[PDB]
Amino acid sequence: VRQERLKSIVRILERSKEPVSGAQLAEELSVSRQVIVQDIAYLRSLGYNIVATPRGYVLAGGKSGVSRLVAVKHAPEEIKEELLCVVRNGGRIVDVIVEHPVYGEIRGIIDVSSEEEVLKFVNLMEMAKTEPLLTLSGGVHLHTIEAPDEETMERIMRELKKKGFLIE
Site size for ligand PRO (CB under 6 A): 6
Do 93 and 117 touch, CB atoms closer than 8 A?
Answer: no
**Residue 79 found at the interface with ligand NIO (CB under 6 A):** yes
39 or 82, CB closer to Fe ion?
82
Q: Which stretch binds ligand NIO (CB under 6 A): 1-9, 41-49, 58-66, 76-84?
A: 76-84
Q: Which stretch binds its own copies (CB under 8 A): 28-36, 53-61, 83-91, 100-108?
A: 100-108
Rounded (10°) CA dihedral 66, 71, 73, 78? 0
Query: Which residues neighbour 21 within 8 Å (Cβ) at sequence distance 6 or greater?
Result: 55, 56, 57
Residues constituting the chain: 168
12 or 26, CB closer to ligand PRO?
12
**Residue 103 found at the interface with its own copies (CB under 8 A):** yes
> Taking CB under 6 A as the rule, which mask of x and - marks residues 97-116 in contact with ligand NIO?
-----------x-x------
The amino acid present at 38, given as its one-letter code, is Q
Can you tell me the distance from the alpha carbon of 33 to that of 72, in angstroms, rounded to the nearest whole number?
53
